């Protein structure tokens, strides 16, 4: 009740900024998350003991992979916290409850492999879930952990509020399938440009929450350049391991997954910023103007990748 989390001064100030890095002290990440829920949602949103038990079982269900790990979960949750805190009045009580949880859970039990690799390998998950294979798994793992004894952080919601928050979580997690982002952003672009975008329309809110999820999930590209550049190393460590696994199935991998083509990374990121990242943060800033610092940081990083290509670093 009277028990607040507090962070050291530098973290207390910098955690409010979009470009905050959660740091290398793994043991501080649970407290950072609880801090964010308490300011985002309230000290009454969750029972502390259940929330702490939930966080620790979520952590145990992330694997020791280079990029899709517990540090990514907490990093994606912080980007959502910064969006929510910069857009105080736009979101419901249930949305603030659901979205930080959705971000912490969004890659539960990730193995470091794409949906395509699972399908090419003929993994059992690819027979259970024919599209958004890993994302349906992540939602399945979230419900599993919510059903463990002492882990129902939503216990005080009515039946219909509980059903609504699990549906916010399910859609938010499915929306992190990047295959779905291209069409979602295009529809949001048309709706904003023709002035049909309506935040009282639930299917429009679902789209805007979806785009928030892509924006949070890709948030490596919105950090300060030394963070962006070092995170890219972990991202490619996974891509290249998947490429090795493609070659063991007798399949030439795409260039981004082939370690033999490491020298073209700079030109690859450049393509990714122009095709995905810039469009994403551009359309998010049109809908939610106070997210502009994500777009500005993305543009700063694109210019750094252009500098790498020119041999200026
Ligand atoms: C930074 N960030 C978030 C990510 O990179 C990120 C996070 N998840 N996903 C899925 C991505 C993603 O799609 N990134 C990409 C996309 C296309 N690419 C093409 C190349 C490439 C091409 C030729 C040679 C070469 F070496 C690399 N590199 C790429 N990286
Ligand atoms: Mg994912
Ligand atoms: Zn993710």
From Swiss-Prot:
Binding site residues for a divalent metal cation 2 = 107
Active-site residues? Answer: 68
Tissues expressing this chain: Abundant in the putamen and caudate nucleus regions of brain and testis, moderately expressed in the thyroid gland, pituitary gland, thalamus and cerebellum.
Q: Please tell me where a divalent metal cation 1 binds in this chain.
A: 72, 106-107, 217
The record gives the effect of mutating residue 107 to A as:
Loss of activity and of zinc binding
Residues annotated as binding 3',5'-cyclic GMP are: 68, 269
Please report the stretch or stretches of sequence annotated as the PDEase domain: 1-312
Positions with a binding annotation for 3',5'-cyclic AMP: 68, 269
The subcellular location is: Cytoplasm, Cytosol
- Subunit-level organization: Homodimer.
> What does its UniProt record remark on the domains?
The tandem GAF domains bind cAMP, and regulate enzyme activity. The binding of cAMP stimulates enzyme activity. Composed of a C-terminal catalytic domain containing two divalent metal sites and an N-terminal regulatory domain which contains one cyclic nucleotide-binding region.
Q: What does this protein do?
A: Plays a role in signal transduction by regulating the intracellular concentration of cyclic nucleotides. Can hydrolyze both cAMP and cGMP, but has higher affinity for cAMP and is more efficient with cAMP as substrate. May play a critical role in regulating cAMP and cGMP levels in the striatum, a region of the brain that contributes to the control of movement and cognition.
For this chain, the family text in UniProt reads: Belongs to the cyclic nucleotide phosphodiesterase family.
Look up the record and name the associated disease: Dyskinesia, limb and orofacial, infantile-onset: An autosomal recessive, early-onset hyperkinetic movement disorder characterized by axial hypotonia, dyskinesia of the limbs and trunk, orofacial dyskinesia, drooling, and dysarthria. The severity of the hyperkinesis is variable. Striatal degeneration, autosomal dominant 2: An autosomal dominant disorder characterized by striatal degeneration and dysfunction of basal ganglia, resulting in hyperkinesis.
- What name has this protein been given in UniProt? cAMP and cAMP-inhibited cGMP 3',5'-cyclic phosphodiesterase 10A
Q: Gene for this protein?
A: PDE10A
- The portion of the full protein included here is 724 to 1036 of 1055
């Amino acid at each position: 009740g009277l028990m607040q989390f507090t962070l050291p001064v530098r973290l207390c100030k910098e955690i409010e900024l979009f470009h905050f890095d959660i740091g290398p002290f793994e043991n501080m990440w649970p407290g950072i998350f609880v801090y964010m829920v308490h300011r985002s949602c309230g000290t009454s949103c969750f029972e502390l003991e259940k929330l702490c038990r939930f966080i620790m079982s979520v952590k145990k269900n992330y694997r020791r992979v280079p990029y899709h790990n517990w540090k990514h979960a907490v990093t994606v949750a912080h980007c959502m916290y910064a969006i929510l805190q910069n857009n105080h009045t736009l979101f419901t009580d249930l949305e603030r409850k659901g979205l930080l949880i959705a971000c912490l859970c969004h890659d539960l039990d990730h193995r470091g492999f794409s949906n395509s690799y699972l399908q090419k390998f003929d993994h059992p998950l690819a027979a259970l879930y024919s599209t958004s294979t890993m994302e349906q798994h992540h939602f399945s793992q979230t419900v599993s952990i919510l059903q463990l004894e002492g882990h129902n952080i939503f216990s005080t919601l009515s039946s219909s509020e509980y059903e609504q928050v699990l549906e916010i979580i399910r859609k938010a997690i499915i929306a992190t399938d990047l295959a779905l982002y291209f069409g979602n952003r295009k529809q949001l672009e048309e709706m904003y440009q023709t002035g049909s975008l309506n935040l009282n329309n639930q299917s429009h809110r679902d789209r805007v929450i979806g785009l928030m999820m892509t924006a949070c999930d890709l948030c490596s590209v919105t950090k300060l350049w030394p963070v962006t550049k070092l995170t890219a190393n972990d991202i490619y460590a996974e891509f290249w391991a998947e490429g090795d696994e493609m070659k063991k199935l007798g399949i030439q991998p795409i260039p981004m997954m082939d370690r033999d083509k490491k020298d073209e990374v700079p030109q690859g990121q450049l393509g990714f910023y122009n095709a995905v990242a810039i469009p994403c943060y551009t359309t998010l800033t049109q809908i939610l103007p106070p997210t502009e610092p994500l777009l500005k940081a993305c543009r700063d990083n694109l210019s750094q990748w252009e500098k790498v290509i020119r041999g200026e670093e």
